[PDB]
């Protein structure tokens, strides 16, 4: 995020980091329950990648994080790689997350819920802060 | 869902 600010630690408890086997953060995701993470299909997650829950500072070794293995990747069958449309994947965890003060789920909308243009929302992540 | 134990500050 360019021109954002640091979050309060633990205040976005559904936010996960997707890391490869070398420990490199490559995408975010969100917990929707103890067993499932939603992310973008174009992130290209495989069962060799790791879900890191409960993280705040990726440079600190002191945080009580959960490193969760991925059992199966469910890429939406309507995902179109050419247009990047329907850009959603579900990850079924091998190891359930343990919910706590710093690890818990985001709500899903109903299919008929409305979010109007001009509404102020929030986004979070460990993406670049400058290009 | 959707209600953090540690409230965000925006």
């Amino acid at each position: 995020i360019v021109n954002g600010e640091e979050a309060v630690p633990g205040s976005w408890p559904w936010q996960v980091s997707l890391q490869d086997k070398t420990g490199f953060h490559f995408c975010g995701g969100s917990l929707i329950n103890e067993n499932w993470v939603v992310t973008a299909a174009h992130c290209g997650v495989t069962t060799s990648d790791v879900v890191v829950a409960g993280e705040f500072d990726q440079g600190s070794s002191s945080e009580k994080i959960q490193k969760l293995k991925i059992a199966k990747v469910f890429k939406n069958s309507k995902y179109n790689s050419l247009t990047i449309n329907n850009d959603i994947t579900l990850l079924k965890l091998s190891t359930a997350a343990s919910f706590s003060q710093t690890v818990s789920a985001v709500c899903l909308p109903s299919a008929s819920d409305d979010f109007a243009a001009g509404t102020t929302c929030v986004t979070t992540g460990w993406g670049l802060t400058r290009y | 869902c959707g209600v953090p134990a540690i409230q965000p500050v925006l």
Binding site: C27, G28, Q58, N76, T83, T123, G125, G127, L128 | -
Partner: protein, 96 residues
């Protein structure tokens, strides 16, 4: 290098019709745009949440997807529109 500490930003939703002024026919019905407000999602944010408060609870409205290649803060970012996708989520959870 990605930052060590988790970042946040508040930003407005746009309509797809207005987002098309920026991105033309690249905007599909399963996309929602947000930003162009002095902040931007950027590389490494992909897959993470765009949440809006609804009846007191944070609700997943978008999944960070694509946008400007330089993360321009005057151009809207594009997110997967979760309301268009939530049937599939529910069907997948129920079957697995």
């Amino acid at each position: 290098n990605t930052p060590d500490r988790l970042q946040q930003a508040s930003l407005p939703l746009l309509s797809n019709t207005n987002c098309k002024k920026y991105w033309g026919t690249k905007i599909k019905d399963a996309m929602i745009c947000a930003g162009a407000s002095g902040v931007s999602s950027c590389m490494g944010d992909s897959g993470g949440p765009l949440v809006c408060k609804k009846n007191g609870a944070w609700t997943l409205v978008g999944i960070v997807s694509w946008g400007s290649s330089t993360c321009s803060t005057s151009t809207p970012g594009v997110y997967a529109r979760v309301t268009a996708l939530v049937n599939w989520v529910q069907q997948t959870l129920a079957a697995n």
